[PDB]
Ligand binder design. Structure first.
Ligand code: HEM
Ligand code: HEM
Lengths: 145, 145
């Protein structure tokens, strides 16, 4: 359930999430496009879903992909800001879950973002500790799918 | 064009937007729900468009309405943060425009949000100059619809 998943975000997890978000959230365009191109390069089978964004190999030059990527980083901004209150974190998680359920994205396929996040964190010198904290936040969205 | 509408927001308009957003954007849940409930109160004809949110007269108690309202406020946060780079503001505006075009929201119907915005600004004592600055930002999205 989303409520049990949300209960796993302990004080330490929340701390690691905010501390890493301080660094990767400072460049939403850059790290957002980085997240997306790493997803597509590492998991080429997901590109079919992003048919509306056109030629994703163009990266930053693709205006629809740049728009999409910035907006995705504000969804993560939103989750970080709701960590104090689990009732609000769950209702924004469930709204974004609906946007993925209508695109037929399963929990397993949503989980493919963990690889990209681990990599962008590692290029900013945030290791496995931080990648695991973010995997727990992704798990809250997965519970809603 | 959308870029034209973007490029004409002047330094004083951007200042007024940022100053009012420092206050109305600091309580995204309270002010987002207030925005949505004032739209439904004054423009009852729009209620049918939001049937996914269920009973919107429940206000803050309605989880789907609260989640939607918080996410709307992050779309505005995104717009405010992109004010100095028209190319980034135009690609995030075009993405949100697609969300409304698919729901068949015309430029005139999107403009119905100006009444709610004026009133929420007024509750924090931001007058007509501020309401006019926000109508110019809303007009950038109308240029995409
Ligand atoms: C950190 C995880 C992720 C977050 C926070 C996230 C967030 C978002 C947001 C905010 C949107 C825009 C929704 C809309 O306007 O309709 C979106 C769209 C989308 N997402 Fe995700 N997403 C994530 C991971 C994924 C993954 C891993 C997949 C695919 C396996 C996926 C597939 C989609 C698709 C297909 C769209 C629609 C694209 C379009 O047509 O514009 N998302 N996502
Ligand atoms: C400040 C202006 C507005 C902003 C920034 C805005 C933003 C948003 C956002 C971010 C979404 C979610 C998109 C998605 O998940 O697919 C949304 C949904 C929607 N908006 Fe707006 N919106 C605004 C004004 C309006 C107005 C004035 C109308 C109606 C005349 C409207 C009608 C809709 C509808 C029908 C939905 C879909 C609701 C649902 O089924 O979830 N929006 N809007």
């Amino acid at each position: 359930s989303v409520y049990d998943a949300a209960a796993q975000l302990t004080a330490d997890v929340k701390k690691d999430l905010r501390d890493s978000w301080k660094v990767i959230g400072s460049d939403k365009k850059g790290n957002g496009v980085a997240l997306m191109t790493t997803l597509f390069a590492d998991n080429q089978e997901t590109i079919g879903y992003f048919k509306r964004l056109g030629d994703v190999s163009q990266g930053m030059a693709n205006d629809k992909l740049r728009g999409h990527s910035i907006i995705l980083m504000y969804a993560l901004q939103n989750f970080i800001d709701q960590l104090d209150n689990p009732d609000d974190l769950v209702c924004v998680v469930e709204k974004f879950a609906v946007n993925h359920i209508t695109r037929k994205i399963s929990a397993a396929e949503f989980g493919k973002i963990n690889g990209p996040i681990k990599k962008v964190l590692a290029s900013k010198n945030f290791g496995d500790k931080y990648a695991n904290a973010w995997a727990k936040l992704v798990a809250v969205v997965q519970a809603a799918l």
